Amino acid sequence: TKEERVLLMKVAILAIVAAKKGNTDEVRKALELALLIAKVSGTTEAVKLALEVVARVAIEAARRGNTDAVREALEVALEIARESGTTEAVKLALEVVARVAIEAARRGNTEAVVEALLVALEIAKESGTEEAVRLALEVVKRVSNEALKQGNVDAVKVALEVRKMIEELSG
Amino acid sequence: TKEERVLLMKVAILAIVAAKKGNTDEVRKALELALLIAKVSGTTEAVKLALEVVARVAIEAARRGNTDAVREALEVALEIARESGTTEAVKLALEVVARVAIEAARRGNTEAVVEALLVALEIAKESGTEEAVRLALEVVKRVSNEALKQGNVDAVKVALEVRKMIEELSG
Amino acid sequence: TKEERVLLMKVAILAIVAAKKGNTDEVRKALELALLIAKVSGTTEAVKLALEVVARVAIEAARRGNTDAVREALEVALEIARESGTTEAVKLALEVVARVAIEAARRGNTEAVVEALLVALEIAKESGTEEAVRLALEVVKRVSNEALKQGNVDAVKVALEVRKMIEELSG
Amino acid sequence: TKEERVLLMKVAILAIVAAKKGNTDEVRKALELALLIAKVSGTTEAVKLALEVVARVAIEAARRGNTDAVREALEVALEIARESGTTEAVKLALEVVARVAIEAARRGNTEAVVEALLVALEIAKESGTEEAVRLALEVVKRVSNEALKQGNVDAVKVALEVRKMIEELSG
Amino acid sequence: TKEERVLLMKVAILAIVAAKKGNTDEVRKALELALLIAKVSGTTEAVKLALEVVARVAIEAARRGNTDAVREALEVALEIARESGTTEAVKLALEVVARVAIEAARRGNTEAVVEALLVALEIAKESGTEEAVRLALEVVKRVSNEALKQGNVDAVKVALEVRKMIEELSG
Amino acid sequence: TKEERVLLMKVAILAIVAAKKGNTDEVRKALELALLIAKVSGTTEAVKLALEVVARVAIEAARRGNTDAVREALEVALEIARESGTTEAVKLALEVVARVAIEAARRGNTEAVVEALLVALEIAKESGTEEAVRLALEVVKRVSNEALKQGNVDAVKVALEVRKMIEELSG
C-alpha cells in the first residue's frame, strides 16, 4: 500500500511538471502508469490514490492552460473507475472531475470545464446507476455554483445545459 | 588509513569526471569501488571517507544534470552505511543525502532532490531506529530551508510531503 | 521565526510589485507561498505575519486598481485563519479585511470594498462563533465610518447592507 | 601578488562578459575561481582583489539585468570574507555589497538591491561583531541615500526595513 | 540636514506642479515622500521642513482649485506632527493649516477652508493638550479675520462654528 | 588631438540620436565613452571637447524631452571636470550646465532646468573654490535671465532658490 502510494506520488509530480512544460505525451503515459499501479495493487485504496494523482495533474494542467492534458486525465479518471468496477470508484472519479472543473472555472479555463462536465455525464453513463447520475448532477451543481461565485457565467451556462443532458441520459 | 583515503580520492575524481562526461556506467563502478575500499579497510574512518566520495560525486552530478548518477550514488550511500552497520554510518549517509539535495535544490535539479529525500527516508527505515528517523527529518528540513532561500518552492513542497511520509513510516 | 518573517517580507514585496505590474497570477502564487511559510512554521506569529503580507498586497493592489488580486488576497486571508484554526487568527484575518476595505474606500475602489465586506461575513461564518460575527460587524462599521469621512456613500450603503446580512447569518 | 592580481583580472573580465551574455553558470564558476585564487595566495591583498572582482561582476550584472548572477556574486563576497576570517575582509565584503546595491538602485534594479541589502545583514551576522553590524548599517544608509537621489523610493523603503532588521539581529 | 532640505524642495516642486496638472495621485505620493524623508532624518528641522513642503503644496492646490489634493495635504500635515510626537510639530502643523485656509479663503476656495478648519480641530484632538486646542482656536481666528477682510463671509461663518466645536471637543 | 576630436564628434552624434530615439541607456554609454576618450588623451583640449559633447547631447535631449538623459549628461559633465582636476575644466563643466538649462528653459523643460541648476551647485561644491561658487552663481543668473525673457517664471523661481542654496553652501 505505502510503496504504491509513494510511486503514485512520483507519477503525479512527473505528470504535473510535464503538463507545465507542455509535454502532454509524457502526461498521458504517466496517467496510464497511475492506472497500471492501481491495477497491480488490486485495492480500493490504490484506485482512490490513482484518481487523486489524476485530479492533481488535471487541476495543475488546467491552471497551466494545458487543456489537452486535462481532457486526457479526465478520460483516465473514468477508465480507473471502470477498471475498479465499483460504485465508490465511480463516485471518486466524479469527485476528480468536480475538482478539476471547479478550479478550471476559477482559473477561467471554461474549455476544460466544458470537457469535464461532459465527462461527468459519461462516467454516470458508464456506471448505469441512478446514484451515479445523481452524483454527476452534484458535480455539475458544484461547478456552476463556484463558477457563479467566480463570475464565470459561460461555465454556468454550460453546466446548466449539461445538467439537463444528464437527466435526459437517465430518462 | 592514509593509502585508503588516497585511493578513495582517486575514485572520487574519476567518478566526478565520468559524471560530467555522462558516463554513468563508469560512475556506478567507481561508487562500488569506494564501498569495496571501505569494506577492505573495515574501519569507521574508511566508511566515512567512502561516504564523502559518494557525496562529492552526487553533488557534482546534480550540478551537471546527471540525475541518474545521483540516484545511484544516493543508493550507494545507503549501502555503505548498511555495510558498516553502525548508527554513525547511518547518520553520515543521511548527511551525504542532505548535501546532495541541498546543492541540487540550489542548482534547480528538483528531480534529484526528490530522489534524495526519498532515500533519506529509506536510510532511516534501514536503520529502524528513532534517532535515524529524526536525523532523516533533519535532512528534509535542511533541504526545504535552503530550497526556500533559493526560491525552489517545488523542492520545498516535496520535502514537506516526504517529512510526513517519514513520520508515517516511523508510526 | 526571524527567517520566516524575512521570507514573508520577500513574498510581500514581490506580490505587491506583481500587483502593480498587473501580474495577478504571480500575486496568487506569492499569496499561497505566504500561507505555506506560515504552515511550515506552525506558529501563531508566522500566521499573523502571513496575514500582514496579505494585507499589504491587497491594500496596494486596491490602490493600483487590481481588484482581482485584492479578491484573491482576501480569500487567502480567510484560508490562513482557517489553516491556523484559532480565534485569534480569525480576528487577525478580519483585521486584514478591514484595512483593505478602508484603504480601498479611501482610494475610491468601491468594488474592492464590496468584496472585502462579503469576505468579512464569510470569515465569521467559517469561524461559526458569536465573537467572530461581532468582529465582522466591527470591520463593516470601520469601513462605513471611514468611507463616510471620505465621502464614499456607495461604500457606506453597501456596508450597511452587509452589516444586516452578517446579523442575518448569525440569526 | 602581481600574477594573482592579473589572473583575478582575467576572471573578472570573463565573468562580466558571461553575465552580459546571460551565462550565469559560467559566472558562478569564475566567482569561485576568484575565491580559489585568493585562497591559494593566502594574503589579505589577494582577498581584497578577489572581492574587487566580485564587485565588478555583480555591478555589471545588475546593469545588465542579470539579478541571478548578482545574487551569487553577493554570496561569494561573503564567502571570501569568511575564508579570510578577518575584520578587514568583512568590511571589504560589505563595501562590495554597497557598491552593487548603489549602482543597482541607480540602474533601477531594485530586486538586486533588496538581495544585496539582505546579504549585508548576513555578512555582519557571520562576523558576529558590533563593528560589522555598524558597517552593514552604513552600507544600507549609502544605498538609501543614493537611491533617494535617483528617485528609487522602493529601494529606500526596503533599505529602511533592512536597517531595522540589522539592528534587531544585533539586539 | 541640507541634503534632506534639498530633497524636500524637490518633493514640493513636483507635488505643486502635479496639483496644477490635476494629478492628485502623484501629489499624495510626494506628500508621503516628504514624511518619509523627515522620518529618515529623525530631526525636528526635517519635520518642520516637511510641513513647509505640505503647506506649499496645499496652498497652490487651493489656488489651483484642487481641493482634493488640499484635503490630502492637510491630513499629511497632521500625520507628520503625529510622527514627530512633539508639541512643536503639532503647532507647526496647525500653522500649515492656517496658511492654507487663509490663502484658500482669499482665493475663494471656501470648501478647502472648511476642510482645513476641521483638520485644525483634529490636530488639537490628536495632541490632546490645552495648548494645542488654544493654537487650533488661533488658527480658526486667523482664517475668519482674513476671510472677513476678503469678504468671504461663508468662510467666516464656518470658522465661527468650528471655533465652538473645538471648545466643545476640549470640554 | 584631431583624431580624438573626430571620435568625440562620433560619440556626440550617436548619443544625440539615441536620446531622440529614447535609448537613454545608449546615451549613458556614449557619455562615458566621451570621458574615456578625454582620459586616454590626457589633454585639456580633449577634456573641453568631451564637455562639448556632453553639452550637445543634453541640449538636444532637453529639446526632445528626454530629461533622464539630460540628468545623466549633467552628472557626466561634473565627472569629466573631476577627472581633469583643473579649475578650467570646472568652469567649462559649469558652462555646459548653463547651456543646457538655458535651452531647456527656452524649450519649456523646467524639470531639466531644475536638475541642471542643482548640478551647477554640486560642481562648485566638488571644486571647493570661491571662483567655482561664483561661476555657479553666474550659471544660475544666466538661466533666470533667459528664462525671464522666455516667460518661464517657474524656472526663474527655482533659479532664485538655487542661487541662495549655492551661497549657503559656500558659507
Short mmCIF file of N, CA and C in Angstrom, two decimals, chain E residues 2 5-6 9-10 13-14 17 20 56 60, chain F residues 111 114-115 118 121 125 154 158 161 165 169:
data_model
loop_
_atom_site.label_atom_id
_atom_site.label_comp_id
_atom_site.label_asym_id
_atom_site.label_seq_id
_atom_site.Cartn_x
_atom_site.Cartn_y
_atom_site.Cartn_z
N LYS E 2 21.04 69.59 5.17
CA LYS E 2 20.97 70.31 3.91
C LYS E 2 20.43 69.42 2.79
N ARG E 5 16.78 68.80 3.13
CA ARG E 5 16.05 70.01 2.75
C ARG E 5 15.94 70.13 1.24
N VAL E 6 17.04 69.85 0.54
CA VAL E 6 17.08 69.94 -0.91
C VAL E 6 16.14 68.92 -1.55
N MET E 9 12.66 70.05 -1.04
CA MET E 9 12.39 71.09 -2.03
C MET E 9 11.98 70.48 -3.36
N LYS E 10 12.68 69.43 -3.77
CA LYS E 10 12.31 68.68 -4.96
C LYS E 10 10.89 68.15 -4.86
N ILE E 13 8.25 70.98 -5.22
CA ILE E 13 8.11 71.45 -6.59
C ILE E 13 7.30 70.47 -7.43
N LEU E 14 7.58 69.18 -7.27
CA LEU E 14 6.90 68.14 -8.03
C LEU E 14 5.42 68.08 -7.67
N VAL E 17 3.39 71.14 -8.99
CA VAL E 17 3.13 71.06 -10.42
C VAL E 17 2.13 69.95 -10.74
N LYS E 20 -1.23 71.28 -9.94
CA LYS E 20 -1.62 72.19 -11.01
C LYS E 20 -2.08 71.42 -12.24
N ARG E 56 3.14 74.45 1.17
CA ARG E 56 3.31 75.00 -0.17
C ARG E 56 2.39 74.30 -1.17
N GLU E 60 -0.95 76.09 -3.07
CA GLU E 60 -1.00 76.20 -4.52
C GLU E 60 -2.15 75.36 -5.09
N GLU F 111 11.85 70.94 -15.62
CA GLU F 111 12.39 69.83 -14.85
C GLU F 111 13.88 69.65 -15.09
N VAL F 114 15.78 72.54 -13.45
CA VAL F 114 15.94 72.36 -12.01
C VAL F 114 17.11 71.44 -11.70
N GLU F 115 17.21 70.33 -12.42
CA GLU F 115 18.31 69.40 -12.26
C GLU F 115 19.65 70.06 -12.56
N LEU F 118 20.83 72.42 -9.88
CA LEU F 118 21.36 71.67 -8.75
C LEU F 118 22.77 71.16 -9.04
N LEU F 121 25.50 73.78 -8.62
CA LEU F 121 25.91 73.83 -7.23
C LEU F 121 26.89 72.71 -6.90
N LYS F 125 30.68 72.74 -5.49
CA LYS F 125 30.98 72.05 -4.24
C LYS F 125 32.15 71.09 -4.42
N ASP F 154 8.58 79.78 -13.67
CA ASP F 154 8.86 78.62 -12.83
C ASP F 154 10.36 78.37 -12.72
N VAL F 158 12.87 78.80 -9.36
CA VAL F 158 13.79 77.74 -8.97
C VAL F 158 15.23 78.25 -8.93
N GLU F 161 16.02 80.26 -5.87
CA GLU F 161 16.21 79.40 -4.71
C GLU F 161 17.58 78.74 -4.72
N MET F 165 20.92 78.75 -2.29
CA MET F 165 21.47 77.49 -1.81
C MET F 165 22.97 77.41 -2.07
N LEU F 169 25.86 77.06 0.67
CA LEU F 169 26.87 76.02 0.60
C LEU F 169 28.27 76.60 0.76
#
